[PDB]
Design an enzyme around this catalytic site. Structure first.
Site, mmCIF file in Angstrom:
data_model
loop_
_atom_site.group_PDB
_atom_site.id
_atom_site.type_symbol
_atom_site.label_atom_id
_atom_site.label_comp_id
_atom_site.label_asym_id
_atom_site.label_seq_id
_atom_site.Cartn_x
_atom_site.Cartn_y
_atom_site.Cartn_z
ATOM 1 N N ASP A 24 19.039 -1.296 14.405
ATOM 2 C CA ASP A 24 19.337 -0.445 13.258
ATOM 3 C C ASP A 24 20.401 0.593 13.566
ATOM 4 O O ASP A 24 21.310 0.798 12.759
ATOM 5 C CB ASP A 24 18.071 0.243 12.776
ATOM 6 C CG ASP A 24 17.143 -0.682 12.011
ATOM 7 O OD1 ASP A 24 17.464 -1.889 11.820
ATOM 8 O OD2 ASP A 24 16.055 -0.274 11.551
ATOM 9 N N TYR B 259 9.481 2.841 14.068
ATOM 10 C CA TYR B 259 9.922 3.303 15.364
ATOM 11 C C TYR B 259 10.117 4.823 15.348
ATOM 12 O O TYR B 259 9.893 5.494 14.328
ATOM 13 C CB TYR B 259 11.191 2.567 15.799
ATOM 14 C CG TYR B 259 12.275 2.478 14.752
ATOM 15 C CD1 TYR B 259 12.995 3.597 14.379
ATOM 16 C CD2 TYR B 259 12.606 1.263 14.171
ATOM 17 C CE1 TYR B 259 13.998 3.518 13.434
ATOM 18 C CE2 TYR B 259 13.613 1.166 13.235
ATOM 19 C CZ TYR B 259 14.315 2.293 12.866
ATOM 20 O OH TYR B 259 15.314 2.216 11.924
ATOM 21 N N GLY C 109 20.780 -12.094 2.238
ATOM 22 C CA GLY C 109 21.467 -13.126 2.965
ATOM 23 C C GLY C 109 21.214 -13.178 4.439
ATOM 24 O O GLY C 109 20.905 -12.169 5.063
ATOM 25 N N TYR D 152 17.656 -8.754 14.624
ATOM 26 C CA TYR D 152 16.292 -8.832 14.127
ATOM 27 C C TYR D 152 15.637 -10.137 14.547
ATOM 28 O O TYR D 152 14.476 -10.140 14.937
ATOM 29 C CB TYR D 152 16.249 -8.709 12.608
ATOM 30 C CG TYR D 152 16.175 -7.311 12.041
ATOM 31 C CD1 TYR D 152 16.409 -6.177 12.819
ATOM 32 C CD2 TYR D 152 15.847 -7.127 10.716
ATOM 33 C CE1 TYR D 152 16.341 -4.906 12.281
ATOM 34 C CE2 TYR D 152 15.773 -5.853 10.169
ATOM 35 C CZ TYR D 152 16.019 -4.751 10.955
ATOM 36 O OH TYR D 152 15.936 -3.508 10.361
ATOM 37 N N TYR E 149 25.713 -11.555 4.766
ATOM 38 C CA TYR E 149 24.663 -11.073 5.666
ATOM 39 C C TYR E 149 24.011 -9.721 5.356
ATOM 40 O O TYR E 149 22.933 -9.426 5.884
ATOM 41 C CB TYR E 149 25.208 -11.037 7.086
ATOM 42 C CG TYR E 149 25.439 -12.422 7.635
ATOM 43 C CD1 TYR E 149 24.433 -13.107 8.305
ATOM 44 C CD2 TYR E 149 26.652 -13.064 7.451
ATOM 45 C CE1 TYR E 149 24.636 -14.375 8.788
ATOM 46 C CE2 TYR E 149 26.862 -14.341 7.921
ATOM 47 C CZ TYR E 149 25.854 -14.995 8.593
ATOM 48 O OH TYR E 149 26.075 -16.268 9.072
ATOM 49 N N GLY F 270 21.729 -7.574 3.599
ATOM 50 C CA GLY F 270 20.641 -7.612 2.652
ATOM 51 C C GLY F 270 19.988 -8.955 2.746
ATOM 52 O O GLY F 270 19.896 -9.548 3.823
ATOM 53 N N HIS G 250 23.391 -7.543 13.006
ATOM 54 C CA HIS G 250 22.108 -6.903 12.703
ATOM 55 C C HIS G 250 21.021 -7.946 12.437
ATOM 56 O O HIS G 250 19.913 -7.858 12.963
ATOM 57 C CB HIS G 250 22.270 -5.978 11.492
ATOM 58 C CG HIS G 250 21.057 -5.167 11.195
ATOM 59 N ND1 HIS G 250 20.303 -5.351 10.057
ATOM 60 C CD2 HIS G 250 20.456 -4.177 11.893
ATOM 61 C CE1 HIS G 250 19.289 -4.501 10.065
ATOM 62 N NE2 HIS G 250 19.360 -3.775 11.168
ATOM 63 N N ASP G 251 21.363 -8.962 11.649
ATOM 64 C CA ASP G 251 20.430 -10.007 11.251
ATOM 65 C C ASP G 251 20.021 -10.789 12.517
ATOM 66 O O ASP G 251 18.842 -11.064 12.758
ATOM 67 C CB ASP G 251 21.008 -10.851 10.110
ATOM 68 C CG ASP G 251 21.252 -10.229 8.747
ATOM 69 O OD1 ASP G 251 20.753 -9.138 8.424
ATOM 70 O OD2 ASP G 251 21.998 -10.788 7.918
HETATM 71 CA CA LIG Z 1 20.434 -10.072 6.048
#
Ligand SMILES: [Ca+2]
Length: 119
Positions: A93, A67, A31, A51, A27, A29, A47-48
């Site tokens: 983030d 932001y 991925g 988003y 996950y 980057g 995080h992914d």
């Molecule tokens: Ca990712």
């Protein structure tokens, strides 16, 4: 935006080069699928997903949205002038950067073969 996220990482984890988190596990980057390989990867999974949720907001583009935030004296703050998109993305983030600082970094998990290991 990614530049700001990079800076968040530089400020919560100054002991590593930011790019150490740019291609890690399933996950971090590139991925976005499969079994998180460890706790750091779990940080990236959240995080992914964060988003993906922010992307539901009209015109909200997490890699690109600028932001308003501050990293000072060990603390990250998302500022009050942020609209819903900016606030959401900044929070994604901020939480991830904090998560990265508390997760062990396993060199074996850097640059893994996503096609083979992240199905
Ligand atoms: Ca990712």
């Amino acid at each position: 935006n990614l530049y700001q996220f990079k800076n968040m990482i530089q400020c919560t984890v100054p002991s590593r080069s930011w790019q150490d988190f740019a291609d890690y596990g399933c996950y971090c980057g590139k991925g976005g699928s499969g079994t998180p390989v460890d706790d750091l990867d779990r940080c990236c999974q959240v995080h992914d997903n964060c988003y993906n949720e922010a992307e539901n907001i009209s015109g909200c583009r997490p890699y690109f949205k600028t932001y308003s935030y501050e990293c000072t004296q060990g603390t990250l703050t998302c500022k009050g002038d942020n609209n819903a998109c900016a606030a959401s993305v900044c929070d994604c983030d901020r939480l991830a950067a904090i998560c990265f600082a508390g997760a062990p970094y396993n060199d074996a998990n850097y640059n893994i073969d996503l096609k083979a290991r992240c199905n």
